[PDB]
Amino acid sequence: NVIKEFMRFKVRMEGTVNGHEFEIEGEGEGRPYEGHNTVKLKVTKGGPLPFAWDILSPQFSKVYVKHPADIPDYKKLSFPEGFKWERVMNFEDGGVVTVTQDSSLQDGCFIYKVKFIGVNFPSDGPVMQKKTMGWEASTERLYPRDGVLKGEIHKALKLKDGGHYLVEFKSIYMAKKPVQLPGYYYVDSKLDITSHNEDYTIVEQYERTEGRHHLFL
Amino acid sequence: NVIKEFMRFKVRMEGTVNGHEFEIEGEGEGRPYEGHNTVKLKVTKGGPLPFAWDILSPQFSKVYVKHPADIPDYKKLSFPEGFKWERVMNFEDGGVVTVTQDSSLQDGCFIYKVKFIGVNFPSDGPVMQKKTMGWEASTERLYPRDGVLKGEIHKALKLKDGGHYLVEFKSIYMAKKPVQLPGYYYVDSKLDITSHNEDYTIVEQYERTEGRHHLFL
Amino acid sequence: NVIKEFMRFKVRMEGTVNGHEFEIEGEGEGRPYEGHNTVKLKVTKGGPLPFAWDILSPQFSKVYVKHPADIPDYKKLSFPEGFKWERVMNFEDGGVVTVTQDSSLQDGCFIYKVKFIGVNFPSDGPVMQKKTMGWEASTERLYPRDGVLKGEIHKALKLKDGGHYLVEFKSIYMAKKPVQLPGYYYVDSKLDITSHNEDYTIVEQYERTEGRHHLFL
Amino acid sequence: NVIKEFMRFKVRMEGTVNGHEFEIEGEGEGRPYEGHNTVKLKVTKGGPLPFAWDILSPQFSKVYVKHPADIPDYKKLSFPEGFKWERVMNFEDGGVVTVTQDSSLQDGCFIYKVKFIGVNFPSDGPVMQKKTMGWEASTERLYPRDGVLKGEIHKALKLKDGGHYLVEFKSIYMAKKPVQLPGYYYVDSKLDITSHNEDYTIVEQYERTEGRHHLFL
């Protein structure tokens, strides 16, 4: 087995939001079978960011989702080769983001390569004015489709003046080799920003993430 | 107590799907504080239906959602006056449905009046070809907004040739009198068709529905 | 040919916007082959309306669209039997409307029966606060699909304090019996509110609508 | 004065579609005040492309749009500094694309830098199976919003076996310096693939694009 009880990872993101180009690099670690992982990020180019860090936080590790024995762990089974993941984030005020990523395993460490493009965010909106205060804990709905695994989430960012800023996530997970696909299931996640410097150029995150069947089944 | 341990309801739906006009009348019952109810429906006009019954099933009782003590039960608190609910159902193949309903209390019995309009369903699609096999259990994401309660769900209809037919639900719950609104929370639901006649003109449904905080909190 | 150079019509709408029920009845007339028609409406029940009239204005006659000889006039050809039309109106601030209609012909007079359900409009939004000042002239993109005619438009309502309120229209035109379908084409339209009383309970409208190929063809 | 009657351009694209990375370089020319331009493209990395070329064709020069004297030419006025343009392409089968671009003027030649991310395209769909055969001529609806110029289009890809594959374009044009914005208007366009080799690694395109008021005004 190539996936140990403790695994480290390296991540690199090249992105663009409302015309602003940036590059982020980071290191992370966690326990794949327990559903715990952490990551320390640094904005290497284009810093400081003129937008909310929160839109970038869920783009930095679903191989770390704790899966019970009866639910095929598609993402873990895809290794050593790995998987690719794609995403559409539809924000309630017109903002749209598409993400494309490659997950590989090189010398016992997971390697993540992310590309991000965020467009149509209002200048006076919560993203461009940094009015967000982290994500609420979420629940993803997953199912097999077109030979790959897909998942959707109704997420929300908490606001400074109170209230929520709603975002719909549509994710696609694609294995680099044909492996076992699960049926209809759910993934609960809670991402927290554990520490950050004043301008968000150095950020530390934590994520608890577990897969399960619906409670009524 | 205005809402008793055991409550009955009467429901009437006037609808249109792909130009086909129909009317449905029903009678139901259940336990509001336990999170479960049943309903028997009869197609009084426009029978037999040339589309999947399943798209109509979740339009026939959220006052029956079991809520913990720490989550304000907005829908129960709205009574004797009651509440109105509205909904948008966005199907993956282009089909769209808007629903509008009024919930009142007349002489110890809940009265539900539903109006349904379903449009843009492909003639060769699972709705018009009756290829659906019930809903999978679901999880609604709720939050307060614009002085009322809103909730969204990523639902799915099971297909007989295998696979899923995806539908996004967007619901709005509006009290007739200003009552206490809850915060961010979730409602798990599971609707089953318990019995039906050959042409789906007489149908019986069961729904278990419970409110809760996200499992990681 | 059952459709003459001058044709009259009568229309009735039963609708609901944000829980508010209403009924509208009207009489109209126009010239089918010239591309223009007029209509006088009166709110028979639910008057005065607490929302903007403008959202109802495009639901009151596409058989009146002028078509050149080289573009099959599907809607005119559908008569004496007639056609049914359905619509989805997606507003930028979340408001969603579905409309279903039946168009028939009785002794030289077209009979229109409309059902309208409008949901999710913000209470402080331009619809519920009556801040709209009529529609801008529009351009519909049409094409045949699933044995019927479809069309989409990027429309906009002019705002009182300046700016626009965007709405995407998705319409489906369905002949009761199969008749010749056109290919890809466009329809230019301009609807005007010619007169109205103070509370919009009596309203007169004018529409100019003509079909054409794209100008670069 | 800076934009001459005849202007040349260089374009570079770094993109990803369904996990497949590619790079495209090209050179074009045309007449800005007349509303027409040409471009020759070469796939420099990731060739041959396993998807339809057509989705990339409209990403390679709106400074070339012929504008009448009464409609402020925002994009031409933005020069020598230039503009940035962003886009969302919503395909009817779930595919989503976000594009971000930078347009500048260097040594009397326009320089275009494009980043493209395409996600959620079905493996058996029109894009991944190359079932498309060019775009139909289109009509963009433009308006000023949030201090910038926005435009939406209901586009369509012609299918090899007949019918259309629908795509909704949402574009945002942002000048690098505060310049005069137009009002509500339209842009007609027709993009043709004039020449290509067997695997689409070398492609030549032509575009005729002109701005105008609605025909009824």
Side-chain angles (χ1 to χ4, degrees):
Chain A
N1 210 112
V2 292
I3 300 175
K4 303 179 179 181
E5 61 166 79
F6 177 71
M7 289 298 273
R8 281 187 165 102
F9 73 85
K10 286 185 179 65
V11 62
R12 179 181 167 79
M13 180 195 272
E14 289 183 347
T16 316
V17 172
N18 275 22
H20 188 91
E21 299 191 283
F22 60 96
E23 293 178 337
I24 294 161
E25 289 194 330
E27 285 197 295
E29 56 185 88
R31 295 174 185 279
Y33 302 96
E34 305 304 326
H36 298 296
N37 75 127
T38 54
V39 64
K40 180 176 172 61
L41 297 315
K42 186 191 175 183
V43 184
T44 56
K45 198 177 183 176
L49 306 178
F51 58 91
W53 176 267
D54 289 327
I55 69 164
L56 304 177
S57 66
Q59 324 307 326
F60 302 116
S61 203
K62 295 307 202 193
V63 66
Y64 290 86
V65 179
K66 182 179 185 172
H67 275 88
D70 69 330
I71 301 177
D73 201 324
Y74 182 74
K75 288 170 269 83
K76 280 187 187 64
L77 289 168
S78 80
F79 283 95
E81 290 72 25
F83 71 101
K84 289 183 179 297
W85 68 260
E86 291 179 318
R87 179 176 284 158
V88 188
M89 300 199 289
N90 293 305
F91 298 77
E92 70 172 311
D93 64 354
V96 186
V97 175
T98 57
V99 196
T100 191
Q101 197 260 22
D102 183 84
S103 293
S104 60
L105 183 62
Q106 187 187 269
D107 297 310
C109 179
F110 293 123
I111 301 298
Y112 301 152
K113 293 190 183 69
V114 203
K115 283 187 172 183
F116 187 105
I117 292 174
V119 303
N120 215 7
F121 288 109
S123 67
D124 57 341
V127 170
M128 299 311 288
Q129 289 303 301
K130 298 200 264 286
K131 294 174 178 169
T132 70
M133 282 182 99
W135 298 98
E136 290 280 14
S138 77
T139 298
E140 186 182 20
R141 185 280 302 265
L142 301 91
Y143 58 93
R145 171 71 68 83
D146 199 31
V148 300
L149 180 62
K150 300 182 76 172
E152 295 84 39
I153 335 176
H154 278 124
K155 282 175 67 48
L157 278 168
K158 287 171 279 178
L159 295 170
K160 277 181 178 59
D161 287 51
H164 291 94
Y165 175 50
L166 319 162
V167 197
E168 185 201 27
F169 275 43
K170 291 184 181 291
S171 304
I172 309 89
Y173 313 97
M174 303 144 286
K176 290 175 191 164
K177 60 169 182 189
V179 291
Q180 244 262 262
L181 275 165
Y184 202 90
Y185 82 111
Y186 293 86
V187 166
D188 287 330
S189 306
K190 185 173 179 291
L191 194 155
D192 306 312
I193 299 299
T194 53
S195 68
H196 61 85
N197 56 2
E198 202 187 80
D199 66 348
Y200 286 86
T201 43
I202 292 172
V203 184
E204 293 190 35
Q205 317 182 163
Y206 167 71
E207 185 198 20
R208 186 193 165 178
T209 181
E210 296 164 26
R212 57 166 179 86
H213 294 295
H214 188 276
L215 302 181
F216 293 1
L217 289 174
Chain B
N1 292 248
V2 69
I3 295 171
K4 301 181 175 181
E5 224 96 87
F6 179 73
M7 289 299 274
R8 288 184 184 275
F9 69 88
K10 273 182 279 177
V11 61
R12 188 188 181 197
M13 180 194 273
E14 286 179 23
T16 319
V17 173
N18 270 24
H20 189 93
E21 299 187 277
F22 61 96
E23 280 166 30
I24 296 165
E25 286 188 325
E27 203 165 49
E29 57 177 71
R31 297 193 173 274
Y33 304 91
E34 287 198 57
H36 62 79
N37 65 134
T38 50
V39 66
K40 184 172 189 63
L41 298 317
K42 285 178 168 64
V43 180
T44 51
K45 198 171 180 176
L49 307 175
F51 58 90
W53 175 267
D54 289 328
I55 70 168
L56 305 174
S57 69
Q59 327 302 330
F60 303 113
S61 47
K62 295 306 204 191
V63 63
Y64 290 84
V65 179
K66 179 182 185 176
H67 278 87
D70 60 334
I71 301 175
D73 201 327
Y74 180 75
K75 285 170 273 90
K76 277 191 188 61
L77 288 169
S78 70
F79 284 93
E81 286 78 15
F83 71 102
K84 286 178 178 293
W85 68 263
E86 288 185 320
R87 175 173 291 160
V88 192
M89 285 161 77
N90 291 305
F91 297 75
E92 72 169 311
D93 63 357
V96 185
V97 173
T98 57
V99 194
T100 187
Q101 197 260 28
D102 183 276
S103 294
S104 60
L105 180 61
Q106 282 157 239
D107 309 311
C109 180
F110 291 130
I111 304 298
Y112 300 152
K113 186 172 183 177
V114 204
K115 282 187 180 177
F116 190 104
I117 292 174
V119 304
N120 214 10
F121 289 102
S123 71
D124 64 342
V127 170
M128 302 312 287
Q129 291 295 322
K130 300 178 191 180
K131 292 182 172 177
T132 67
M133 277 181 86
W135 298 96
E136 289 273 10
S138 75
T139 302
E140 186 182 19
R141 186 283 301 271
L142 305 90
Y143 56 94
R145 175 65 69 89
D146 192 32
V148 300
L149 182 64
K150 296 196 177 186
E152 298 82 29
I153 336 176
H154 279 121
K155 284 177 65 45
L157 278 165
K158 283 173 281 186
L159 295 176
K160 57 186 185 183
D161 292 281
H164 292 94
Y165 176 48
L166 315 164
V167 197
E168 182 201 30
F169 274 46
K170 291 175 172 291
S171 304
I172 308 93
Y173 312 98
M174 303 145 281
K176 292 171 195 170
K177 69 160 184 296
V179 290
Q180 186 67 247
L181 275 166
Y184 203 88
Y185 82 110
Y186 293 85
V187 167
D188 284 332
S189 304
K190 189 175 179 290
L191 197 152
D192 304 307
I193 300 299
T194 53
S195 64
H196 58 84
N197 58 352
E198 301 189 278
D199 61 341
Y200 287 78
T201 42
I202 293 171
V203 184
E204 289 190 41
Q205 307 173 182
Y206 174 77
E207 188 212 12
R208 185 190 167 189
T209 178
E210 292 172 31
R212 59 164 177 81
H213 291 290
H214 186 281
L215 298 173
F216 290 2
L217 305 177
Chain C
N1 207 324
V2 292
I3 294 175
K4 305 300 172 177
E5 297 188 289
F6 178 73
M7 292 295 271
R8 290 187 180 272
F9 74 88
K10 36 204 274 289
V11 59
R12 177 173 166 82
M13 180 197 272
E14 295 191 343
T16 311
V17 177
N18 273 21
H20 190 90
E21 297 186 290
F22 60 95
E23 281 162 43
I24 298 164
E25 284 184 343
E27 290 181 77
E29 61 180 67
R31 298 190 62 83
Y33 303 90
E34 289 185 14
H36 59 91
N37 66 131
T38 58
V39 65
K40 180 179 185 178
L41 296 315
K42 55 185 178 68
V43 183
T44 54
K45 201 181 180 179
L49 306 178
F51 57 92
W53 177 266
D54 290 326
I55 71 166
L56 308 174
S57 72
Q59 326 308 324
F60 302 113
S61 209
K62 297 306 205 191
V63 64
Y64 289 90
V65 180
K66 179 182 184 179
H67 278 80
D70 69 331
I71 301 177
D73 200 332
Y74 179 75
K75 290 173 269 84
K76 278 189 187 62
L77 289 165
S78 79
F79 285 95
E81 305 104 299
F83 70 102
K84 290 177 182 289
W85 68 260
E86 287 187 324
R87 175 174 290 161
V88 187
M89 303 200 283
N90 294 306
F91 297 75
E92 73 170 314
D93 64 351
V96 182
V97 178
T98 59
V99 197
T100 185
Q101 197 263 21
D102 186 279
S103 299
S104 58
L105 180 62
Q106 194 184 308
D107 301 329
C109 184
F110 294 115
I111 314 294
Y112 300 153
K113 294 171 183 180
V114 205
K115 281 187 180 183
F116 187 107
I117 291 173
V119 303
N120 216 11
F121 289 104
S123 66
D124 62 327
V127 169
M128 300 312 290
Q129 289 300 307
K130 300 169 72 182
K131 305 188 194 82
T132 67
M133 293 196 308
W135 297 96
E136 287 278 9
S138 73
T139 297
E140 187 183 19
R141 184 281 302 266
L142 302 91
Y143 58 96
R145 173 67 69 83
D146 189 36
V148 298
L149 182 63
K150 290 194 175 187
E152 295 83 35
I153 335 177
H154 278 121
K155 285 174 67 47
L157 276 168
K158 285 177 279 183
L159 253 23
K160 221 148 195 173
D161 288 282
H164 293 90
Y165 175 47
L166 319 164
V167 199
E168 187 204 29
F169 275 43
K170 286 181 170 285
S171 307
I172 311 98
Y173 309 101
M174 307 166 288
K176 288 168 186 168
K177 258 82 170 183
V179 285
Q180 199 185 195
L181 276 166
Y184 204 88
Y185 83 111
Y186 291 85
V187 167
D188 289 330
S189 307
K190 185 179 182 294
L191 192 150
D192 303 316
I193 299 300
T194 55
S195 71
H196 62 89
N197 56 351
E198 287 187 66
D199 68 347
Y200 288 85
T201 46
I202 294 167
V203 183
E204 290 193 46
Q205 309 180 178
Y206 175 84
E207 182 201 19
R208 181 181 168 199
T209 180
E210 296 171 37
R212 55 167 181 80
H213 293 287
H214 185 278
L215 301 187
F216 292 179
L217 301 180
Chain D
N1 208 262
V2 289
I3 300 170
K4 295 184 176 298
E5 312 303 293
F6 180 73
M7 289 296 274
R8 292 183 176 275
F9 69 90
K10 288 183 181 182
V11 59
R12 275 215 80 237
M13 183 197 267
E14 299 194 316
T16 313
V17 174
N18 274 27
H20 189 92
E21 296 186 274
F22 58 93
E23 276 160 32
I24 294 162
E25 286 197 294
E27 46 197 346
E29 58 182 68
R31 297 180 174 277
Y33 302 91
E34 294 184 19
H36 53 81
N37 61 133
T38 50
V39 65
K40 185 175 186 183
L41 299 312
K42 287 181 186 296
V43 178
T44 45
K45 193 184 175 189
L49 307 175
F51 59 90
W53 176 267
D54 290 329
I55 65 161
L56 309 176
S57 64
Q59 325 305 329
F60 304 115
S61 42
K62 293 305 199 193
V63 64
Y64 289 84
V65 181
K66 185 184 191 302
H67 276 79
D70 61 345
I71 300 177
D73 200 328
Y74 182 72
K75 289 170 272 82
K76 279 189 186 61
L77 287 165
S78 75
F79 285 93
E81 289 90 334
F83 69 104
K84 289 179 181 295
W85 66 259
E86 287 190 325
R87 178 176 287 156
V88 188
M89 286 165 74
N90 294 304
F91 297 74
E92 71 170 307
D93 66 354
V96 185
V97 172
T98 56
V99 197
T100 186
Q101 196 261 21
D102 184 83
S103 298
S104 59
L105 186 60
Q106 188 185 115
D107 304 306
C109 182
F110 292 121
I111 304 299
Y112 302 153
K113 294 171 186 179
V114 203
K115 282 183 173 178
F116 187 106
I117 292 173
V119 302
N120 213 12
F121 290 106
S123 69
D124 61 340
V127 178
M128 300 313 288
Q129 292 302 325
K130 304 182 198 174
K131 300 174 183 177
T132 70
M133 50 175 241
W135 297 95
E136 291 276 12
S138 73
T139 299
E140 184 182 21
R141 186 281 304 263
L142 304 92
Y143 56 97
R145 174 67 70 83
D146 196 32
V148 296
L149 183 60
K150 295 197 176 185
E152 290 86 38
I153 335 179
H154 275 123
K155 285 178 64 50
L157 275 170
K158 283 174 281 183
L159 290 170
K160 280 186 178 64
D161 291 331
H164 295 90
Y165 175 52
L166 319 165
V167 198
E168 187 199 26
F169 277 44
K170 291 192 170 191
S171 303
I172 311 88
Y173 313 96
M174 303 143 282
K176 293 169 191 171
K177 61 168 172 189
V179 101
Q180 188 63 235
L181 278 164
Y184 201 88
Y185 83 110
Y186 297 86
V187 163
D188 285 342
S189 309
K190 186 174 175 289
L191 195 153
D192 305 310
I193 300 301
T194 52
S195 188
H196 62 85
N197 52 358
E198 203 150 278
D199 64 352
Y200 285 82
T201 46
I202 295 166
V203 183
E204 285 188 61
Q205 314 180 171
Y206 171 76
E207 185 202 18
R208 183 186 165 187
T209 179
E210 301 172 26
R212 56 164 181 84
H213 288 296
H214 187 274
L215 277 319
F216 293 176
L217 298 178

